[PDB]
């Protein structure tokens, strides 16, 4: 679906923070004893509203909330870290968890270049068949 932001306002700029998974490379800063404290592991940046992507994302977060809350109702886990990993697993089971039927809408295998290789090799023996 396309996202049409239907909120009263939209802040069009996203001043963000995230973590640096490899925050140091040289020296002893990778050693926990010498490295930064909890407050200093973050990097920052600024994104603008090209293609209205910020305004779309805010609405998306809004619409995700209901389904997310219902998911949390059904689990007995105290802290859930596995939603994206389970999505990845479901992706894999969707494509390769069963038999892949070629030309079907759910099998993503292309033999078209493999078609140009076997349709060019039709002529490898049929033209020189003396």
């Amino acid at each position, epitope marked *: *679906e*396309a996202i*049409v*932001n*239907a909120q009263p306002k939209c802040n*069009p700029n996203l001043h963000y923070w995230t973590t640096q998974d490899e925050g140091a490379a040289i020296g002893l800063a990778w050693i926990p004893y010498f490295g930064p404290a909890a407050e200093g592991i973050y990097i920052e940046g600024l994104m603008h509203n090209q293609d*209205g992507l910020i305004c779309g994302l805010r609405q998306l977060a809004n619409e995700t909330t209901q389904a997310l809350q219902l998911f949390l109702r059904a689990t007995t886990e105290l802290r859930t870290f596995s939603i994206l990993n389970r999505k990845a697993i479901d992706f894999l089971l969707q494509r390769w968890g069963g038999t892949c039927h070629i030309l079907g809408p759910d099998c993503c295998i292309e033999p078209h270049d493999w078609t140009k290789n076997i349709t060019d090799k039709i002529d490898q023996i049929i033209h020189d068949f003396v």
Partner: antibody
Amino acid sequence: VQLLESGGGLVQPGGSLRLSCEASGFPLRDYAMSWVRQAPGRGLQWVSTIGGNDNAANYADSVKGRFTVSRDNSKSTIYLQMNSLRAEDTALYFCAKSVRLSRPSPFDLWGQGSLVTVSS
Amino acid sequence: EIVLTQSPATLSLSPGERATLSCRASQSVSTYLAWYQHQPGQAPRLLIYEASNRATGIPARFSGSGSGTEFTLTISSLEPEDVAVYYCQQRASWPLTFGGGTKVEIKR
């Protein structure tokens, strides 16, 4: 319910012009509103959509940086402010109402169209 | 963009006949596809949404079918008032795109 468009006519290339579209018979704040244009002898091309807030605008690539769509819900009016107009922009411009605010289509009500001609 | 291609380009049919119009997408749009009628110099009118749902006030002869990359609009029995251009439109992704239209002529 009706959509009445206005503001069309002749304008020189490089100029600015603001179009308006007035809604009647329904509360404007509940629906996403769009602009669609029809060049002579051609089909329909989507131009822009505005959602619930003035910053929730989406544009065709060929109008980005040149056209701005906006709304004034208190006066029940939609606007299209155009700048840097070219010969390719002469067209009949339609306003279009969505069935809801949070998705851009189906277009269940259309205005009659206002013609904007950019020509020397 | 997702390109929408409508076929055929022209249709000349007598009243009472069935008309079948087709819209094809370059990649799947699932069921996010609507059809609009535009008769000469009047405002366009919504006919069908979500590939198969008939809009309010539209005659029962109009129906829609299809999914994925293939969709059809059927008019089961033509009357003179259906002379118009018909457009499909997808809403799965920005930019919104329209088909090129089908002009239906009534052969009286």
